[PDB]
């Protein structure tokens, strides 16, 4: 149920330089079908590897990685292609190039992200990202941004709680379209201000922070009354308080315009 | 199946042996959607059944679990029924004192602060059983309708059918998600048990006026507890606050709960 002409044989791609690593296997820059491109190449893990595909093949937007197709021969051949980005993460660009931007240059990206995040929410069967993050937010040489890596993304799915812990409620309950936008109000403040949310911890100190003590990064004049406003809603503990993306693409493009016109 | 329930049968202590035919049953005294429970007698003894309606595993998991309890504030394991899965049974003592739910919100019955206290430190003693065995048990399902009540005015947790044998990025995380990542500890139950300690004190039952699904929300997502009077003694109010912590990790464990309890009924 792959169509067919998103079958891949291992003959078509050209392998050129490793660009990742991990638990999974290796990425490699390379070839295919007339295309630079990103192969993730791999060594319970089928399953996996057969939902990313059948989201992947879903996709179309130009705020979204561009898919070219899996090769399914054999479990050892096992192997996903996308078009190649060749300006970078954005977590590279903030973090470790310290790349200047000025204010047009951030809200563009942050649009960018939040259309092909309103484009996953809202189709048929939509998607969640889940792993909605600045490592998975690539740039092209013009400025303009999308959101890459559906590794973690799934299909959103159609007496004693009175007495149940947090922690088992949140997993007895369904993951919702509200946690990618979570994600990327952090995403949003990470544009604006150029630092990592919670610089000085390691990840797992800095959920603990978010999730139980509630804190959440400053905020200060580095960010304007309407973005801020934003991000106060977009990481509310309360999904339900969370906008919707297109609430967030209006608001954001909203200031584009006025930030042009000034 | 017939290979669980076998290795079960070859497990289980020869007294524990049931048939359905030994047991008779009056009438029901607790609901849910794994079957029923009843009032009854077997081998001429009062007794409390549950009868059930996936279930070979649940059904041998928790005779399992029962057989290995051995402590006053615990349930007393009777017998189980395991001839085949339509006959499927869990006999244990019947406790004639009813549940701290009726006592609490159906009787409406004034306790004074001693006889609370000794109720809480009995369903602690229990919890901290369970939860210091060589396999800690959880019992996942820790409220007021599964903590029984002699006429002595001691307690036992009750029904083991949700119970256990306890086995990233993140930065970028929603909580709701991050919270998906760390499974089911002991700590789960403590939170429970801080809900029933203040059931217990006011008489009321957790958020009253919410359905269940409203009052797990407002706890989870809004952080909200239920109201502490400046009435409630400070020894307590402070194991509610931290029992209740959504940071399980800031949660104390049973043998504290117990050592804190025990010190308010020296000056009670
Ligand atoms: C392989 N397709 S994927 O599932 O979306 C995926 C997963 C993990 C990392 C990438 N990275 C990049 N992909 C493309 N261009 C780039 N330039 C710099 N990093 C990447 C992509
Ligand atoms: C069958 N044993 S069980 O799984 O632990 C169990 C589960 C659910 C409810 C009970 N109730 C009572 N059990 C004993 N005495 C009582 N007096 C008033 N209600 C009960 C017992």
Same mark, same amino acid.
């Given at each position: 149920?792959?169509?067919?002409?998103?079958?891949?044989?291992?003959?078509?791609?050209?392998?050129?330089?490793?660009?990742?690593?991990?638990?999974?296997?290796?990425?490699?820059?390379?070839?295919?079908?007339?295309?630079?491109?990103?192969?993730?190449?791999?060594?319970?893990?089928?399953?996996?590897?057969?939902?990313?595909?059948?989201?992947?093949?879903?996709?179309?937007?130009?705020?979204?990685?561009?898919?070219?197709?899996?090769?399914?021969?054999?479990?050892?051949?096992?192997?996903?292609?996308?078009?190649?980005?060749?300006?970078?993460?954005?977590?590279?660009?903030?973090?470790?190039?310290?790349?200047?931007?000025?204010?047009?240059?951030?809200?563009?990206?942050?649009?960018?992200?939040?259309?092909?995040? !309103?484009?996953?929410?809202?189709? %048929?069967?939509?998607? /969640?990202?889940? +792993?909605?993050? #600045?490592?998975?937010?690539? =740039?092209? &040489?013009?400025?303009?941004?999308?959101?890459?890596?559906?590794?973690?993304?799934?299909?959103?799915?159609?007496?004693?709680?009175?007495?149940?812990?947090? !922690?088992?409620?949140?997993?007895? %309950?369904?993951?919702? /379209?509200?946690? +990618?936008?979570? #994600?990327?109000?952090?995403? =949003?403040? &990470?544009?604006?201000?150029?630092?990592?949310?919670?610089?000085?911890?390691?990840?797992?100190?800095?959920?603990?922070?978010?999730?139980?003590?509630?804190?959440?990064?400053?905020?200060?004049?580095?960010?304007?009354?309407?973005?801020?406003?934003?991000?106060?809603?977009?990481?509310?503990?309360?999904?339900?308080?969370?906008?919707?993306?297109?609430?967030?693409?209006?608001?954001?493009?909203?200031?584009?315009?006025?930030?042009?016109?000034?």
């Amino acid at each position: 149920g792959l169509p067919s002409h998103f079958h891949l044989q291992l003959s078509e791609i050209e392998f050129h330089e490793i660009i990742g690593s991990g638990s999974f296997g290796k990425v490699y820059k390379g070839r295919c079908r007339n295309k630079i491109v990103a192969i993730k190449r791999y060594r319970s893990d089928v399953d996996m590897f057969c939902r990313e595909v059948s989201i992947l093949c879903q996709l179309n937007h130009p705020c979204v990685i561009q898919f070219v197709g899996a090769c399914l021969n054999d479990p050892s051949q096992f192997a996903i292609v996308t078009q190649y980005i060749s300006g970078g993460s954005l977590f590279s660009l903030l973090h470790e190039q310290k790349r200047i931007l000025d204010l047009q240059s951030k809200l563009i990206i942050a649009v960018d992200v939040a259309k092909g995040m !309103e484009y996953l929410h809202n189709l %048929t069967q939509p998607i /969640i990202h889940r +792993d909605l993050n #600045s490592h998975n937010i690539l =740039l092209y &040489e013009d400025g303009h941004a999308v959101v890459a890596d559906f590794g973690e993304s799934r299909f959103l799915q159609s007496g004693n709680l009175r007495w149940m812990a947090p !922690e088992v409620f949140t997993q007895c %309950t369904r993951y919702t /379209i509200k946690a +990618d936008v979570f #994600s990327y109000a952090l995403c =949003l403040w &990470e544009i604006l201000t150029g630092e990592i949310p919670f610089a000085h911890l390691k990840p797992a100190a800095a959920d603990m922070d978010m999730a139980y003590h509630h804190i959440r990064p400053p905020i200060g004049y580095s960010i304007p009354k309407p973005i801020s406003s934003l991000l106060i809603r977009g990481w509310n503990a309360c999904p339900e308080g969370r906008p919707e993306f297109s609430e967030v693409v209006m608001k954001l493009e909203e200031c584009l315009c006025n930030i042009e016109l000034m």
